[PDB]
Coordinates of C-alpha atoms in Angstrom, one line a residue:
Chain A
X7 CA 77.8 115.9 64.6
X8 CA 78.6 116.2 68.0
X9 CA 76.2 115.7 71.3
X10 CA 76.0 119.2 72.8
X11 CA 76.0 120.3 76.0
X12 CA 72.6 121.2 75.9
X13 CA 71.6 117.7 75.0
X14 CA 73.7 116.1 76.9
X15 CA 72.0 118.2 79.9
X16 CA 67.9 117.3 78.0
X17 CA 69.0 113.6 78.0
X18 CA 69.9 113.6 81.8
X19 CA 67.3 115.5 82.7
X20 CA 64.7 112.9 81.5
X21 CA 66.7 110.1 82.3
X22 CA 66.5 111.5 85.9
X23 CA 62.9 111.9 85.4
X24 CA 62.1 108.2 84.5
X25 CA 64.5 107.0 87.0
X26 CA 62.4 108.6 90.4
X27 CA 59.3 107.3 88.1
X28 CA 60.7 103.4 88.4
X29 CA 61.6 104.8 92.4
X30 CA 65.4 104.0 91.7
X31 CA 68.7 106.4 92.3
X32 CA 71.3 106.6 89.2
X33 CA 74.4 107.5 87.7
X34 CA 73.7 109.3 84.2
X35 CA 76.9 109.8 82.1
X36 CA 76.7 111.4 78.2
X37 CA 80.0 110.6 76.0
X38 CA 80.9 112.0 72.8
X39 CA 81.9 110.4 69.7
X40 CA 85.1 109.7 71.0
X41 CA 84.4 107.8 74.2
X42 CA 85.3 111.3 76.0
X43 CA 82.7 112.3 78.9
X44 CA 80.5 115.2 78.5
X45 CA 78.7 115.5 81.1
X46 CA 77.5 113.3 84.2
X47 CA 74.8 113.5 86.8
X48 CA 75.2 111.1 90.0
X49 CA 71.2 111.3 91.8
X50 CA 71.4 111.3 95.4
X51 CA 71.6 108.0 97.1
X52 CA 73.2 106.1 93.9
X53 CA 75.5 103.5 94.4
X54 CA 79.2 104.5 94.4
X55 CA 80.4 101.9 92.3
X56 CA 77.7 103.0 89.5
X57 CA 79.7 105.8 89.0
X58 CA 82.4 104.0 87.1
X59 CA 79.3 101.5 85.7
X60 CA 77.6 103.9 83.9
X61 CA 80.4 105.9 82.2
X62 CA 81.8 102.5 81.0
X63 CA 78.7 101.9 79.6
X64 CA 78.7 105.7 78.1
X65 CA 81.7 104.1 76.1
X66 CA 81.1 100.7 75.0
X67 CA 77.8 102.2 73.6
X68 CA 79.8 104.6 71.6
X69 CA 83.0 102.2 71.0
X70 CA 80.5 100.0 68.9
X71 CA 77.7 101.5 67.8
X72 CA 75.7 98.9 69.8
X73 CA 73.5 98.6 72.8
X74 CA 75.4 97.4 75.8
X75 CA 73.6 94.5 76.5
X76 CA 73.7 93.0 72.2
X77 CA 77.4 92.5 73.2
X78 CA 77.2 90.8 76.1
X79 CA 75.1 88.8 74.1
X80 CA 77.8 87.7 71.9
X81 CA 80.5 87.6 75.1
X82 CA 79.5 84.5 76.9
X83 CA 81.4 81.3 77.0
X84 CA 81.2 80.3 73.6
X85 CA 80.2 83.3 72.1
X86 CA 82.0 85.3 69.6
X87 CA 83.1 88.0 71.5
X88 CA 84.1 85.9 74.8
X89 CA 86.9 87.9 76.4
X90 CA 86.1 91.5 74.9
X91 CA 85.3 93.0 78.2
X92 CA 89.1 93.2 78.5
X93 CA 90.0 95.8 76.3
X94 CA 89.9 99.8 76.3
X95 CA 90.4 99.9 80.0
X96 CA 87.1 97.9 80.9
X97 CA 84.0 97.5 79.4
X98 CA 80.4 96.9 80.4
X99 CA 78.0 94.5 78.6
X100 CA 74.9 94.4 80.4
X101 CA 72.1 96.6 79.7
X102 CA 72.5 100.3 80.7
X103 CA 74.2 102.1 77.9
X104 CA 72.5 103.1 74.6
X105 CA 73.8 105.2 71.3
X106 CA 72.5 108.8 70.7
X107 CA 72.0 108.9 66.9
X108 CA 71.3 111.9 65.0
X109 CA 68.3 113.0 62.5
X110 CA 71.0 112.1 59.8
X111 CA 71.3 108.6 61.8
X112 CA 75.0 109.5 62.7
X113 CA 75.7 108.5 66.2
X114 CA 77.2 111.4 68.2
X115 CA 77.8 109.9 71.7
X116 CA 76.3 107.7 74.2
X117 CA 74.3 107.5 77.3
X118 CA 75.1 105.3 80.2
X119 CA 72.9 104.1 83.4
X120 CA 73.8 102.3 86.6
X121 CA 72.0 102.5 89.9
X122 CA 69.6 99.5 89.9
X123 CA 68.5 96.3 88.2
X124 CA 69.7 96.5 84.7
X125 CA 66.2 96.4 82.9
X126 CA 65.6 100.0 84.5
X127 CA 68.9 101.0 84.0
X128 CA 68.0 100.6 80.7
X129 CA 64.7 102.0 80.4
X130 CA 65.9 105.1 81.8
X131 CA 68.5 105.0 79.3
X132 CA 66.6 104.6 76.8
X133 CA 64.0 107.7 78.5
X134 CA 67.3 110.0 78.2
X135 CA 68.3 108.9 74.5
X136 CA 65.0 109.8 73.0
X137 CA 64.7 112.8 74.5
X138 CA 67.4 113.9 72.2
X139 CA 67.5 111.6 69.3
X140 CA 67.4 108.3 68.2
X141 CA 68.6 105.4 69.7
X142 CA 69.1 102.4 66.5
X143 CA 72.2 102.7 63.2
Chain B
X278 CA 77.7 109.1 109.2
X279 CA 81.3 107.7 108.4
X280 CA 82.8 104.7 110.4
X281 CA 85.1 105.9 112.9
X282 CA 88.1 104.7 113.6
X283 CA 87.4 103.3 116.9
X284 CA 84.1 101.3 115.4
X285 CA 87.1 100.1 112.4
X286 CA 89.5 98.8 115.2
X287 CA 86.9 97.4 117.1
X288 CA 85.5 95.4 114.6
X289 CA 88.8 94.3 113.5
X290 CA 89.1 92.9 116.8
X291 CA 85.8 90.8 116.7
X292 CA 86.6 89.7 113.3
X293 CA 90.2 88.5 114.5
X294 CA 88.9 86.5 117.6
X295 CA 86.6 84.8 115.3
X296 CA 89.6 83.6 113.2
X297 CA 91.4 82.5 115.5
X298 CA 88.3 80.6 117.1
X299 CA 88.0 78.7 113.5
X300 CA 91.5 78.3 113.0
X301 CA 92.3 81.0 110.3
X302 CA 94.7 83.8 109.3
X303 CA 93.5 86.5 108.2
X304 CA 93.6 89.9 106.0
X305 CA 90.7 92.3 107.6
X306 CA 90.0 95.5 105.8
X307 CA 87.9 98.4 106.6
X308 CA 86.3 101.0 104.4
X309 CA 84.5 104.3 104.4
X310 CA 81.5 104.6 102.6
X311 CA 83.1 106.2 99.7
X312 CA 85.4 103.0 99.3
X313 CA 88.0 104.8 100.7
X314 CA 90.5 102.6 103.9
X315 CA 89.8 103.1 107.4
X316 CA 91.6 100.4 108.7
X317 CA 93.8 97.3 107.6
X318 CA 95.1 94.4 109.5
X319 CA 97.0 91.4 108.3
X320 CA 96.9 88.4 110.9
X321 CA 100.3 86.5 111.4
X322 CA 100.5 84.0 108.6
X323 CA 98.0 85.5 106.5
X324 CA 98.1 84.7 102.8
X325 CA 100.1 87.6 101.1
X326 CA 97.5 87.6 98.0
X327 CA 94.9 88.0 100.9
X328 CA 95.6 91.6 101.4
X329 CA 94.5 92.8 98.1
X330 CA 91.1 90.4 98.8
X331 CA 90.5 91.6 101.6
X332 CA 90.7 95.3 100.7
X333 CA 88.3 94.7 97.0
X334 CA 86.1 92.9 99.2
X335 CA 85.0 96.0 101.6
X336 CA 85.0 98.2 98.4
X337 CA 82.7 95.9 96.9
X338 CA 80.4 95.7 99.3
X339 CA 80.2 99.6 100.0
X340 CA 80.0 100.1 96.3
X341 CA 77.0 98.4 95.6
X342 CA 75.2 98.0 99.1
X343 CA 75.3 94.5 99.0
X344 CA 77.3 91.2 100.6
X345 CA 79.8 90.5 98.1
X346 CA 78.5 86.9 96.9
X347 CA 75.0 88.2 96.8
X348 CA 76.8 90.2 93.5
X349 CA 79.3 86.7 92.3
X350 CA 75.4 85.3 92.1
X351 CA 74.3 87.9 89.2
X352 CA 77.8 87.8 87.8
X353 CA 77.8 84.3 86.3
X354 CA 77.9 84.1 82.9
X355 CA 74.5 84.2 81.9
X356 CA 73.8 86.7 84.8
X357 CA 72.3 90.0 84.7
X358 CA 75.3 91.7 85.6
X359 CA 77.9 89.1 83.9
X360 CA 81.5 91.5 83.8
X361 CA 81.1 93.8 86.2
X362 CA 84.1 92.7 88.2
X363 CA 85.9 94.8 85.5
X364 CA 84.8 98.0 86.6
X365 CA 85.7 100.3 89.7
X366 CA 89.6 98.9 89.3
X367 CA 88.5 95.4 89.9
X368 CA 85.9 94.1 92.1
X369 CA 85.4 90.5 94.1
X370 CA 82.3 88.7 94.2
X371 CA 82.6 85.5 96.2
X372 CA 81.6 86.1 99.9
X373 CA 83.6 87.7 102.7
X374 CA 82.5 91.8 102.2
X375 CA 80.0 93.0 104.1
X376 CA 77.9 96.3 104.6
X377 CA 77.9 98.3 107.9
X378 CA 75.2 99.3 108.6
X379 CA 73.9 102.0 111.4
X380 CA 71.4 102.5 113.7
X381 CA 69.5 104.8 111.1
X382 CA 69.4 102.2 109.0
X383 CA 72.7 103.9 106.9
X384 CA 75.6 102.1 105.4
X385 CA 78.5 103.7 106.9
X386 CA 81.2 101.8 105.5
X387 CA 82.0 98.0 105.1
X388 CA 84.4 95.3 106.3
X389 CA 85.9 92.7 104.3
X390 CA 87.8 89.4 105.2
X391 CA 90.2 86.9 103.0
X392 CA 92.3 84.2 103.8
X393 CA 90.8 81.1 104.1
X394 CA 87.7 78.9 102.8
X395 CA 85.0 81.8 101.3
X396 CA 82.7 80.7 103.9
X397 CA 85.5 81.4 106.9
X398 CA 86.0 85.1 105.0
X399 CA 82.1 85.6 105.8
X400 CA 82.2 84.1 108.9
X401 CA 84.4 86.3 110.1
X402 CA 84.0 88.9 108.1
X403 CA 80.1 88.8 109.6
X404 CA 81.4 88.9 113.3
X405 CA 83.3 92.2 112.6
X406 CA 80.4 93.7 111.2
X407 CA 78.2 92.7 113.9
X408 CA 80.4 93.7 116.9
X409 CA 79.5 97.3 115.4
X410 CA 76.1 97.8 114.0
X411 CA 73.9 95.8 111.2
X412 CA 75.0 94.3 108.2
X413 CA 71.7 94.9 106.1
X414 CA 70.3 97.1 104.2
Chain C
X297 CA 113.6 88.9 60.7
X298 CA 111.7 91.6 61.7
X299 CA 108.7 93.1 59.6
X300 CA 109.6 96.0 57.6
X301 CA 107.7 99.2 57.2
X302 CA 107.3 98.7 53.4
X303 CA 105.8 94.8 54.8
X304 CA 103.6 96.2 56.8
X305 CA 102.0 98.9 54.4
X306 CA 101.6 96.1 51.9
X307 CA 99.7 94.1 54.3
X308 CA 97.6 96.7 55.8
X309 CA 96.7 97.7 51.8
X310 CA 95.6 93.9 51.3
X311 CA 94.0 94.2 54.2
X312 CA 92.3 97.5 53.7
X313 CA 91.0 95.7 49.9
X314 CA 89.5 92.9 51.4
X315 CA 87.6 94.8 54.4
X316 CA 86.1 97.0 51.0
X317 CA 85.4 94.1 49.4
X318 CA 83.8 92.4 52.2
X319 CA 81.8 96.2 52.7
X320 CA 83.4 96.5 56.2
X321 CA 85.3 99.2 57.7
X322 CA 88.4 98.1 60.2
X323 CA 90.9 98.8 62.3
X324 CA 94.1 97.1 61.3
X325 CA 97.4 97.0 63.0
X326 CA 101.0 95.3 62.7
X327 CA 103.1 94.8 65.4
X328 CA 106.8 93.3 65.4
X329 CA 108.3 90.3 66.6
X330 CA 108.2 92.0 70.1
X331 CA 105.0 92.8 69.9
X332 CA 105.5 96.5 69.5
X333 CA 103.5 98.7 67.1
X334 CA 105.0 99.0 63.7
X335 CA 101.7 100.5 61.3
X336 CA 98.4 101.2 62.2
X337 CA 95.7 102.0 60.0
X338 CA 92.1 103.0 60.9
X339 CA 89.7 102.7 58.5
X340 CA 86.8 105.8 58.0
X341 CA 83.9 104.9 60.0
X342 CA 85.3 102.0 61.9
X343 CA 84.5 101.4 65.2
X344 CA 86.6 103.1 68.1
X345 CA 86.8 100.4 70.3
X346 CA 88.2 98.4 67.4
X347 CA 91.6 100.6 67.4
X348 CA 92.4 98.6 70.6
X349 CA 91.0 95.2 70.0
X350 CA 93.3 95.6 66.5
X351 CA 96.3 96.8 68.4
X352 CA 95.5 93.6 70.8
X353 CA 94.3 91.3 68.4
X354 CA 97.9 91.6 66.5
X355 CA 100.1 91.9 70.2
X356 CA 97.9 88.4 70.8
X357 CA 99.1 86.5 67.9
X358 CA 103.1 87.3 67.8
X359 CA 103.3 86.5 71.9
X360 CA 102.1 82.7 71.3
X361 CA 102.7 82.1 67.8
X362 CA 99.5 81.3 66.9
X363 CA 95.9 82.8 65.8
X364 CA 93.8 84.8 68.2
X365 CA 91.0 82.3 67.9
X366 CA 93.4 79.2 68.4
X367 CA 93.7 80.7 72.0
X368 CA 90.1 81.1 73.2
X369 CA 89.6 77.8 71.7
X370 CA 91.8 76.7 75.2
X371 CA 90.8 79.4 77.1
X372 CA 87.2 78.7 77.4
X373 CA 85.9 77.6 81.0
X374 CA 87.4 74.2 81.6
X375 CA 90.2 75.1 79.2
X376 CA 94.0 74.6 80.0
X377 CA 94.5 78.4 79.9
X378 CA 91.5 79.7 81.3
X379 CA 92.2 83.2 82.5
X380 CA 94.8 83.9 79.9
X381 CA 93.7 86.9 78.6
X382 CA 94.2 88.3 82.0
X383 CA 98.1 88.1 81.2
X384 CA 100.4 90.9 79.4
X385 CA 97.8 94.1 79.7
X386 CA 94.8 91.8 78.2
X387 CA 94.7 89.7 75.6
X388 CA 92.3 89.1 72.4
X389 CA 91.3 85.4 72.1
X390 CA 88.6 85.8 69.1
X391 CA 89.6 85.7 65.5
X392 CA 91.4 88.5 63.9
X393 CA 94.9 88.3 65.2
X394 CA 97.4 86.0 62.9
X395 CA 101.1 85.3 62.8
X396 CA 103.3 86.7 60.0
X397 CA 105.8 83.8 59.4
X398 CA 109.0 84.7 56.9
X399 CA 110.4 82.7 54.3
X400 CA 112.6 80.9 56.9
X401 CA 109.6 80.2 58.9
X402 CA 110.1 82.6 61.3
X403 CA 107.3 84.9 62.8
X404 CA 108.8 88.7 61.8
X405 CA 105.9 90.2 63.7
X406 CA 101.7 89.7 63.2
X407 CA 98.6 91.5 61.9
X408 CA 95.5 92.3 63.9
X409 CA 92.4 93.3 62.7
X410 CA 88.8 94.5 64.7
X411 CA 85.7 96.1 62.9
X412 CA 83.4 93.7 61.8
X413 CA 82.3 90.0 62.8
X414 CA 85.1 87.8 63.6
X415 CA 85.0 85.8 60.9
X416 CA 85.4 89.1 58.1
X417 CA 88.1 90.2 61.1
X418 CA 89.7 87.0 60.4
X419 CA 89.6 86.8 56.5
X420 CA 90.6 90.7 56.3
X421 CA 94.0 89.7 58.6
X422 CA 94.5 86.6 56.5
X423 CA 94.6 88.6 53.6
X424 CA 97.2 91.2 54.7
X425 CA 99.1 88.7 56.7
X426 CA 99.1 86.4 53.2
X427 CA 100.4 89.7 51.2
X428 CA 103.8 89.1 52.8
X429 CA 104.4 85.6 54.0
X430 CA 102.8 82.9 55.4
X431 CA 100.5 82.6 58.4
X432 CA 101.2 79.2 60.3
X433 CA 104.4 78.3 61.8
Chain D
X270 CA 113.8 82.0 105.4
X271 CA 113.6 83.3 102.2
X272 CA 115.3 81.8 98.5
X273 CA 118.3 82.7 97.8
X274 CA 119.6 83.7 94.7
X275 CA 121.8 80.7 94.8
X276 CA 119.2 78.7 95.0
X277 CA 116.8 80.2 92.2
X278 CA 119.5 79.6 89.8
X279 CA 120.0 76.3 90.6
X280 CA 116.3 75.6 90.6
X281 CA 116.1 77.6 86.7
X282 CA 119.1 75.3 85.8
X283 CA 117.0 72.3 87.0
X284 CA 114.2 73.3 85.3
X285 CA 115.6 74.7 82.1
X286 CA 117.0 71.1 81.9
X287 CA 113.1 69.4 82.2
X288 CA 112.1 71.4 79.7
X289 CA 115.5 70.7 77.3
X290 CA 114.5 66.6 78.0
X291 CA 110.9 67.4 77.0
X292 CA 111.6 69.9 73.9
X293 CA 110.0 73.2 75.2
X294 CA 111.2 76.5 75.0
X295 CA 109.9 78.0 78.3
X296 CA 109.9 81.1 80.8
X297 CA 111.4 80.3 84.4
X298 CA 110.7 83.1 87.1
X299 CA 111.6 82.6 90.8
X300 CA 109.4 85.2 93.5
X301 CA 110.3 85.3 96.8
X302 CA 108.1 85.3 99.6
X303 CA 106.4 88.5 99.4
X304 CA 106.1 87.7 95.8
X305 CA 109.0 89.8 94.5
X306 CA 111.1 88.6 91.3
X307 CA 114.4 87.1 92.9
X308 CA 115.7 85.4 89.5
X309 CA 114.1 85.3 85.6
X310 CA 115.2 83.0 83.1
X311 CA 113.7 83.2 79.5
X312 CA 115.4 80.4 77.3
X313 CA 116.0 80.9 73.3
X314 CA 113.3 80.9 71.3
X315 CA 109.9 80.7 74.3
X316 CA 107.1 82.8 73.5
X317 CA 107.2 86.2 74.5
X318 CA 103.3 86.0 76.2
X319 CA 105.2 83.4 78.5
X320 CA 107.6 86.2 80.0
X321 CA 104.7 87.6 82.0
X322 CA 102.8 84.5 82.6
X323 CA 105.9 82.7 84.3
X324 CA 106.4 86.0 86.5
X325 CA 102.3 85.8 87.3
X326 CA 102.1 82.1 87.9
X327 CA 104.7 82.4 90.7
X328 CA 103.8 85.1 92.0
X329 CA 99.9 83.5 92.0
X330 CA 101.4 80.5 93.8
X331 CA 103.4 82.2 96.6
X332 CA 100.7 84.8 97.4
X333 CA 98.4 81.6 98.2
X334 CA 100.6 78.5 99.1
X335 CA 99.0 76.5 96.5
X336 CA 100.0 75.4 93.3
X337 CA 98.4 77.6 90.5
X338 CA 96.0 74.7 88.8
X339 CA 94.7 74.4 92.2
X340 CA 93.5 78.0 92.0
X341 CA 91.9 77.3 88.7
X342 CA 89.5 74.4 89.9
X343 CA 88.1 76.6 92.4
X344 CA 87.7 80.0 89.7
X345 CA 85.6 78.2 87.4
X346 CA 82.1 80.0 87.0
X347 CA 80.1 78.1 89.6
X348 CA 83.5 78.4 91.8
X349 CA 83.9 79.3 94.9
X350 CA 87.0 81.5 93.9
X351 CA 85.0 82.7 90.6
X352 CA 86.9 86.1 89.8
X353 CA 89.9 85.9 91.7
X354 CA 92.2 86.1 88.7
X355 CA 91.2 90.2 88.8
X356 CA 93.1 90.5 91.8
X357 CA 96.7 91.4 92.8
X358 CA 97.0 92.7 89.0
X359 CA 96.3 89.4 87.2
X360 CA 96.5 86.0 88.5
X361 CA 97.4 83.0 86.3
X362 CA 95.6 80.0 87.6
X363 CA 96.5 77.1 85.5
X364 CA 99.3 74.7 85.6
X365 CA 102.9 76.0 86.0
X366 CA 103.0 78.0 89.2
X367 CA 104.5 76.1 92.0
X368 CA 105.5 77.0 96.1
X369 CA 109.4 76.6 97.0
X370 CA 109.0 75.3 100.7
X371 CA 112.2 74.9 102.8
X372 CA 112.7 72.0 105.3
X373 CA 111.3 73.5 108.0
X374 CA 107.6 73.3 106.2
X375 CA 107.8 77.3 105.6
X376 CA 107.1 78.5 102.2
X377 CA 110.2 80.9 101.1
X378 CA 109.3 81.6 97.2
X379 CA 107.8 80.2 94.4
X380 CA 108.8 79.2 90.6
X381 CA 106.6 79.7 87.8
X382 CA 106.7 78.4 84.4
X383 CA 105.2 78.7 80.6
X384 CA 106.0 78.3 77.6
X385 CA 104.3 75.0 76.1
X386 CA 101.3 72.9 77.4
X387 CA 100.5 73.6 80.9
X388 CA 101.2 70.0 81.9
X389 CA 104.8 70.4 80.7
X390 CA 104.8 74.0 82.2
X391 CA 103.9 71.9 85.5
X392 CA 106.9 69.1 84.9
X393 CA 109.4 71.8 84.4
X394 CA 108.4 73.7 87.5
X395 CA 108.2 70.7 89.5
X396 CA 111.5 69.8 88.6
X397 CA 112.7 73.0 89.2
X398 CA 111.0 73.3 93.0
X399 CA 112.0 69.6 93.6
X400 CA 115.8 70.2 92.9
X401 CA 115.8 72.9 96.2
X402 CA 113.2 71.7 98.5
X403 CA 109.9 70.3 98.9
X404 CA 107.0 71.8 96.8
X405 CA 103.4 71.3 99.2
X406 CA 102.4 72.6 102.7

């Protein structure tokens, strides 16, 4: 299955909604299955350079199946994964991007979330994930 | 507002007569608030891997709102925002960008300074900014 | 020599065996001696961002001759190539990448393989790159 | 003054003998001042990941008058330089990158070198800046 428009829309809508909650501006970006954007929402007053943040964090989400912040876990010096912020074009691995998983538990896209300090770019991640699904394989 | 040209040029010429005051050659960059070049100016003698410094440096800064080295401090490994130099094309994080800022209290645009010791860049890169507006948020 | 096509289907069969065996799902890739792609296979429900590291993984191994991990052992802070993976369009220093070394003990080309942790990376490559030759030069 | 091509290939000569005496296999590249190629020399048998790494490293190296290890001490994390290697598209900033400086004291080029350790990388270029000029500011 495949996030719809609709939900990618429900998902932005209460990440939005959390975000003025917590008092912070933010890029929102939804990606499918694929890595490939379907929709994104840039709040007024958000950084510029979130813009590219949060859809790379749309699509590490998505590219493992993961919570952006469990790699950088494993990609410090010394870690497992030290280096894999290099490949497919740039990836982020600090918190702010979050699977959307299906009722079956199939993930069908990503969220991503830039604009302040990562904790509440990820809690409104997390705010726009479960408004539409789950967020855990 | 945007940075105009003339406020570009004359803070180019603040931040020049400060290198030259410390001994230094210069790359001096100016951008608009979207990231996007005002002005450039490469002092005689400058390092030629300066110029692309110089020019990341002001997009940092205007990007995120922030000095550039405020951002290298969060970007060490085991730091809340450990990658993000990979995003938006490539980023730099030691000192040397800096915000400007307007009279309302608005980032405008932001000037950044390579070619020398980090703390030179900022030096310098601090009297262009001031010869202008405010460099704080 | 370079790896033939019949090679490289063998090897991405052993491969594909091992993954099943080990109840992982990969990406595996061979590339030649010039580290052009030769045979990719993407396993069902692998990873996306694994098609790359794979593709990377195996680029990694035939340009130094040696396996991925065997680099970002070196290329760890303090390392003698620190900042290598910055070289030819990124680089893949964790395990998962290996040589595959001919008869004569020449390296014909290399297998890559992304997926899973690095260590069933690693023992899936070692089995496909063992299918057809050895490993170490 | 800028190198000429006569002099490039008698500093690749010079260098692809170093690294004959030492037994390395090694890329020699030879920028000019504005850190385009003027001369590449790959011998028999060097790692292909060393044909852009020896173009890198002297291009690192001219763009900042330095030799490239001394870039590297500086772009540890904790560095003052800490990220620079995203810059310019890809630094190297180990051993093997050396200035070609004329006898007026003006830097005209650069060699770069790798192939093998980096402290043979460094002999090689060494020998290959030494044979047409002086190699530090």
């Amino acid at each position: 299955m495949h996030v719809t428009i609709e939900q990618a829309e429900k998902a932005i809508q209460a990440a939005r909604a959390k975000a003025v909650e917590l008092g912070t501006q933010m890029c929102i970006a939804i990606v499918d299955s694929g890595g490939n954007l379907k929709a994104f929402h840039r709040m007024d007053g958000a950084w510029v350079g979130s813009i590219d943040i949060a859809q790379k964090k749309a699509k590490t989400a998505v590219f493992f199946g993961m919570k952006t912040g469990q790699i950088g876990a494993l990609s410090q010096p010394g870690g497992s994964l030290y280096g894999i912020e290099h490949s497919n074009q740039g990836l982020i691995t600090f918190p702010g991007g979050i699977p959307i998983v299906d009722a079956d538990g199939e993930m069908s896209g990503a969220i991503g979330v830039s604009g302040s300090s990562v904790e509440n770019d990820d809690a409104v991640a997390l705010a726009g994930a479960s408004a539409i699904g789950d967020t855990e394989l």
